[PDB]
């Protein structure tokens, strides 16, 4: 990303710049390692110790430790990693195009897949500050209101940001209302993160707090979402059944 005077002022721009910085570094590293593997398998490169262990891990499917400079699910194979890496770098290219041409403000209107980002919690922090700066509000008086919209590309308010790829585990979000589900996981269409001024309203008994875990391993917590309980369902059922939100599945 091309940093300019106005660009560095935007928290979203700074986040995306850090993301693409890390993405490019890993992209070239992995590509150079794969090129060395191709050269060895073609017969024109000698197997060094690092090359030998890398080839052994790729043949056995063990994820190389030199790779995965960001947070990844534990025990995941090399194929799952390269597929996810390709998707993440494609998202980074699309974000790069929007930032370079679409302008800085387009970064507000673009829908970001939290799974693709290396540090989505930094994205949530950026969004909060953005809202605070635009509305001249203090940062700590902002609380996150989540509205899942099934309408494609639903209108984005000034403080409403689009996020895709969210997966709801063991629940179905209908009309922004959760209902216990026996399905393995239900993909949330377009989750809208709205940063609203914090009120003194008492959390209703029909409100449940769900963790938004980074991946299916539930090892990294990104943030929490307050959802409404549909029908006569106890929140203790949501707690026991392990209902949660995953940035990536």
């Amino acid at each position: 990303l091309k940093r300019t005077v106005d660009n560095i002022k935007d928290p979203l721009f700074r986040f995306f710049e850090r993301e693409v910085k890390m993405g490019a570094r890993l992209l070239q590293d992995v590509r150079q390692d794969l090129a060395d593997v191709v050269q060895v398998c073609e017969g024109k490169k000698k197997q060094t110790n690092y090359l030998r262990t890398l080839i052994n891990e790729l043949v056995k499917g063990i994820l190389p430790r030199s790779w995965s400079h960001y947070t990844v699910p534990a025990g995941m194979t090399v194929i799952q990693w390269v597929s996810d890496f390709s998707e993440r770098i494609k998202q980074l290219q699309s974000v790069s195009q929007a930032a370079a041409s679409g302008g800085a403000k387009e970064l507000k209107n673009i829908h970001v897949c939290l799974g693709g980002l290396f540090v989505p919690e930094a994205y949530i922090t950026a969004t909060r500050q953005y809202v605070a700066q635009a509305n001249s509000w203090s940062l700590e008086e902002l609380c996150l209101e989540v509205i899942v919209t099934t309408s494609q590309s639903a209108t984005l308010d000034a403080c409403s940001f689009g996020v895709t790829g969210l997966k709801l585990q063991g629940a179905t979000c209908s009309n922004n209302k959760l209902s216990l589900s026996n399905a393995i996981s239900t993909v949330l269409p377009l989750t809208q993160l709205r940063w609203v001024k914090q009120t003194n309203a008492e959390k209703k008994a029909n409100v449940v707090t769900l963790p938004v875990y980074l991946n299916f391993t539930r090892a990294d917590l990104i943030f929490t979402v307050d959802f409404e309980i549909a029908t006569k369902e106890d929140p203790r059922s949501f707690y026991e059944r392990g209902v949660a939100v995953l940035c990536t599945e």
Binding site: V59, K60, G61, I62, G75, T77, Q169, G170, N182, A183, I184, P211, F216, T217, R218, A219, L221, R236, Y239, E240, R241, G242, A244
Partner: protein
């Protein structure tokens, strides 16, 4: 694609409980495939359609290749008699590795009891323990006696020295050295390589966990006045099972695999004893309202079991379990230990007020446990299965 769309029973098969036993013919080939060819084609179809059943289908593939009774020995209980007497040489140690928290020394204790062979059991970990161990090893090698060395994972270097000593030593034909461990990476590779290894895992399930719990807790301890004490233990036992079995279904059950084990159970039993003794003050019976439910719930949620829990959502889950189980309502005749079990019918807490009644209720539990017993959805098992299936394939890649 064409076969999938054209088939009418494909949908019900995809929604079947055991699709691996009724996999439809969805492949095209010039000549009829041999039984192993049909087995591998079904294996591919199951992997594509119903990965959770892959393991089951993998066992079918092994059966269609190595016979229907290839694995059947493993489900049978281990018979250490012949193995230790013959398969094992006198100079080959019998390594008995359990999962952390499990014990395997009782197996060889009973083996020596039935074999009428004198065995000396020695707990390793202290220098006096080391001296007792090596002197008893010398006595047994010169006299053909059995040696037990418990928890030898605590002394890795001493294990290396023991392996070196055994390599040169020439034992008597009846000498048998058993070393019990809890499966640690600290165990030397040379000791594992130069010794027969037996891996012991507890039988999974709420019923087995509660049976192990009741057995460990002294009968006299659960029999002490007031008579309500036993019921408390039952709840505690149930709670322990409900969490430990839930640990199998991580990360859906618990966000991470905590070390809920015997130490927490002993601490909770001690807490129950102390607080119930303080409340009763010698009375033979106390009202269910008088029991310090708040004290027990708080100490188990923040101190006994909640100490290991660092996630706030795992702590919330633990608090919900404790608030559901440890109440006065648990002393009613209609208290429901687990609701919506299997989608119909729910577990009822036993009406008895004696330890033997609770153990009888545990022993008559149906052998149809589902994650609904633990509060989890019944599909959780499927998730576990599919994970294991993927895991198997990953392991099969590492053997390439």
């Amino acid at each position: 694609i064409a076969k999938v769309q054209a088939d009418e029973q494909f949908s019900i098969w995809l929604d079947s409980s055991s699709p691996e036993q009724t996999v439809p013919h969805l492949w095209s080939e010039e000549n009829p495939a041999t039984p192993i060819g049909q087995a591998i084609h079904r294996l591919l179809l199951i992997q594509a359609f119903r990965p959770d059943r892959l393991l089951a289908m993998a066992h079918v593939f092994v059966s269609t290749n190595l016979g229907e009774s290839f694995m059947s020995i493993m489900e049978q209980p281990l018979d250490l008699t012949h193995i230790v007497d013959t398969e094992v040489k006198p100079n080959t140690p019998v390594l008995m590795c359990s999962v952390p928290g499990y014990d395997a020394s009782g197996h060889v204790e009973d083996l020596a009891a039935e074999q009428n062979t004198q065995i000396t059991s020695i707990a390793i970990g202290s220098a006096e323990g080391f001296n007792q161990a090596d002197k008893a090893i010398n006595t047994a090698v010169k006299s053909g006696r059995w040696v037990m060395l418990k928890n030898v994972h605590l002394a890795p270097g001493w294990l290396m020295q023991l392996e070196k000593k055994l390599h040169s030593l020439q034992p008597h034909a009846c000498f048998r050295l058993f070393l019990t461990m809890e499966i640690n990476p600290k165990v030397p590779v040379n000791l594992l390589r130069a010794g027969r290894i037996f891996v012991f895992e507890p039988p999974p399930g709420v019923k087995a966990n509660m049976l192990r719990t009741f057995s460990s807790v002294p009968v006299s301890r659960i029999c002490k006045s007031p008579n309500e004490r036993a019921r408390l233990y039952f709840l505690l036992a149930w709670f322990h099972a409900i969490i430990q079995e839930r640990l199998r279904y991580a990360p859906l059950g618990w966000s991470k695999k905590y070390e809920f084990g015997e130490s927490d159970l002993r601490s909770a039993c001690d807490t129950v004893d102390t607080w119930l003794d303080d409340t009763a003050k010698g009375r033979q019976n106390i009202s269910p309202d008088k029991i310090p439910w708040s004290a027990l719930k708080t100490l188990m949620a923040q101190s006994i079991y909640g100490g290991r829990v660092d996630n706030e959502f795992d702590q919330r889950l633990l608090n919900t379990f404790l608030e559901r189980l440890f109440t006065t309502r648990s002393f009613d005749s209609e208290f429901k230990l687990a609701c919506k079990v299997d989608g119909h019918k729910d577990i009822q807490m036993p009406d008895g007020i004696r330890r033997e009644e609770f153990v009888q209720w545990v022993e008559l539990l149906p052998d149809t446990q589902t994650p609904s017993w633990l509060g989890l959805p019944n599909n959780a098992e499927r998730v576990l299965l599919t994970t294991q299936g993927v895991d198997m394939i990953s392991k099969m890649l590492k053997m390439q």
